Amino acid sequence: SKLAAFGGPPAVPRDRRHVEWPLVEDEDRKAVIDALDGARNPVSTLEEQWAGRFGFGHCVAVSTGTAALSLALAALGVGPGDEVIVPALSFIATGLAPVHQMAVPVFADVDPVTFNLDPDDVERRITGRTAAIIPVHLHGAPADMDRITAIARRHGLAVIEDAAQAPGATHRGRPVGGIGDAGAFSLQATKNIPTCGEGGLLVTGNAELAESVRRGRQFGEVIESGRERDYVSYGLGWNHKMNALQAAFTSAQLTRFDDYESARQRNVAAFLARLAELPGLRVPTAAPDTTHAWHILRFRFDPAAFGLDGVRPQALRSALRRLLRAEGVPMSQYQLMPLPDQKVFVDRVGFGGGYPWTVTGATGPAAGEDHPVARAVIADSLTLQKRHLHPESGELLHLYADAFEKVWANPDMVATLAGA
């Protein structure tokens, strides 16, 4: 039982490591070919099925999760001179969506355990220009929506949920996406309910918001089955149309969602139960009165547990990454820096001439504090992506737990590697 990093046998054999995601069945292939030969509407069918399944008043299918967010901002009257508060830790799309609607993104620090935007820090970053908050259900964990909605009601702000990483997740038993003014979902191939490529869904209880998004996704036009296209546009629109084939594929995926979801919940629970026993390993958790979608598993590692009183947390992160990967556990980072460090948000050039920042006069150094929690989380955390999403990954996650337990049984070697 020598470490694989030093010639030992890997806890995960090479021929056991591959996982297919999306999980393509013959029903998926048939759905795509049927959509191709049907020559049409799978998009409105997906809209109805998603709204029905998750109890939303309205669902508008769009090209991408990013387009869902930007069309949501447009529909809620967010634009030039407006600030949108988003988390300092997220996928870059959350920070770009405001820029796409010519609004200025304002970065709030996150919670050290939930990894979601800290409502206390949101309050500290509100100005007279604040128009909206994009809470992200990051990694599949629902954000503090009671606090976010309370802040929004106080200051008259719009709330758009970025639920891209949290399909099926609940907050006080409510489907995520239906709590804010609108909710954004991504059907990107890597996501928990994927399409065969790109896709987005905007959900809302507000008929007028839905209609705005419906027009915005198709050049501002009104498009109806049986009615000849007149090319009359009623406002600023884009090409944010979903592909029918991708819609048909996701409809097929939805018929297995409940079974896939049960397997993930059971498999992830068993995996984290074993890792939670390892000292200096913090398994990801759902906050109280929420359920986690487990899109990404982020683990925080404490140098204290390996007697590394002096060692930078990044050194332990590096050491654990090398050792776990050698055993065949594909441990990754998800985001190397807080979004505020990204060149686009530092240079503040945007479209050109500093727009949208030029409108608010936020062209010079960023207002408010640094984001030490976002930085601390990145400094000491590794992630598992994709492999745990597959319903038959039970045995694979058992071997992952073997690898973790094996690495933790060599604490002297971890401390040595962290030393260099």
Residues recognised as catalytic: 191
Q: How far apart are CA 233 and CA 226, in angstroms?
A: 18
Q: Is 244 in the site for a second copy (CB under 8 A)?
A: yes
Binding mask 194-233 for ligand PLP (x = CB under 6 A): ----x-x---------------------------------
CB of 78 to ligand PLP, least distance (A): 16
DSSP 255-281: TTHHHHHHHHHHHHHHHHHHHTTSTTE
243 binds, among a second copy, ligand PLP, none (CB under 5 to 8 A by kind): a second copy
90 binds, among ligand PLP, a second copy, none (CB under 5 to 8 A by kind): ligand PLP
Binding flag, residue 105, ligand PLP (CB under 6 A):
no
Task: Find, among 189, 417, 198, the residue nearest to 303 by Cα.
Answer: 417
239 lines the binding site for ligand PLP (CB under 6 A): yes
Residue whose CB is nearest to ligand PLP in the complex, by number: 65
* Pick from 128, 96, 125: nearest CA to 110: 125
Choosing from 50, 91, 107, 408, the residue that interacts with a second copy (CB under 8 A) is 91
Closest alpha carbon to 136 in 85, 77, 200: 85
If one asks whether residue 227 binds a second copy (CB under 8 A), the answer comes out as: no
Among 116, 130, 243, 291, binds a second copy (CB under 8 A): 243
165 binds, among a second copy, ligand PLP, none (CB under 5 to 8 A by kind): ligand PLP
CB nearer ligand PLP, residue 295 or residue 348 = 295
Contacts of 396 (CB under 8 A, 6+ apart): 12, 16, 17, 19, 387, 390
Structure tokens at 10: 């890997």
Interaction residues for ligand PLP, span 153-172 (CB under 6 A): 162, 164-165
Read off the amino acid at residue 311.
V
- The reply, when asked if residue 165 is annotated as ligand binding, is yes
Q: According to CB under 8 A, which one of 15, 208, 224, 228 is a site residue for a second copy? A: 228
Residue pair 163/183 in contact by the 8 Å Cβ criterion: yes
Min CB(115)–ligand PLP separation in Å: 11
Residue 376 to residue 373: CA distance in whole angstroms: 5
CA atoms of 34 and 41, how far apart (whole Å) = 11
SS (H, E, C) 167-196: CCCEECCEECCCCCCEEEEECCCCCCCCCC
Asked if 90 is part of the footprint of ligand PLP (rule: CB under 6 A), the reply reads yes
**The one among 10, 22, 42, 65 contacting ligand PLP by CB under 6 A:** 65
Residue from 335, 381, 393, 410 in contact with a second copy (CB under 8 A): 335
Q: How far apart are CA 288 and CA 17, in angstroms?
A: 33
Nearer Cβ to a second copy (336/420): 336
Q: Does 186 bind ligand PLP (CB under 6 A)?
A: yes
Question: According to CB under 6 A, which one of 136, 169, 248, 308 is a site residue for ligand PLP?
Answer: 136
Q: Which is nearer to a second copy, 243 or 291 (CB)?
A: 243
C-alpha closest to that of 86 among 51, 52, 125: 125
Give min distance, CB of 134 to a second copy, in A: 16
Residues in contact with a second copy, counted by CB under 8 A, come to a total of 69
Residue 93 lies near a second copy (rule: CB under 8 A): yes
* Coil/strand/helix, residue 318: helix
- Strands 104-108 and 182-186 turn out to be unpaired
Surface-to-core class of residue 37, CB atoms within 10 Å of its CB (0-12 exposed, 13-18 middle, 19+ buried): exposed
Which one among 343, 364, 365, 420 touches a second copy, defined by CB under 8 A?
343
Identify the burial level of 19 via C-beta atoms within 10 angstroms of its C-beta, where 0-12 means exposed, 13-18 middle and 19 or more buried: middle
CB 387 within 8 A of CB 403: no
Pick 90 or 393: Cβ nearer ligand PLP = 90
Half-sphere exposure of 253 (CA within 13 A, CB side): 26
Summarize as ranges the residues that interact with a second copy (CB under 8 A): 20, 24, 28-29, 32-33, 35-37, 39, 63-67, 74, 77-82, 91-93, 96, 99-102, 196-198, 219-220, 228, 230-239, 241, 243-246, 332-337, 342-344, 347, 349-353, 355, 358-359
Summarize as ranges the residues that interact with ligand PLP (CB under 6 A): 64-66, 90-91, 93-94, 136, 162, 164-165, 186, 188, 198, 200, 239
Q: Name the binding residues.
A: 65-66, 165, 186, 239
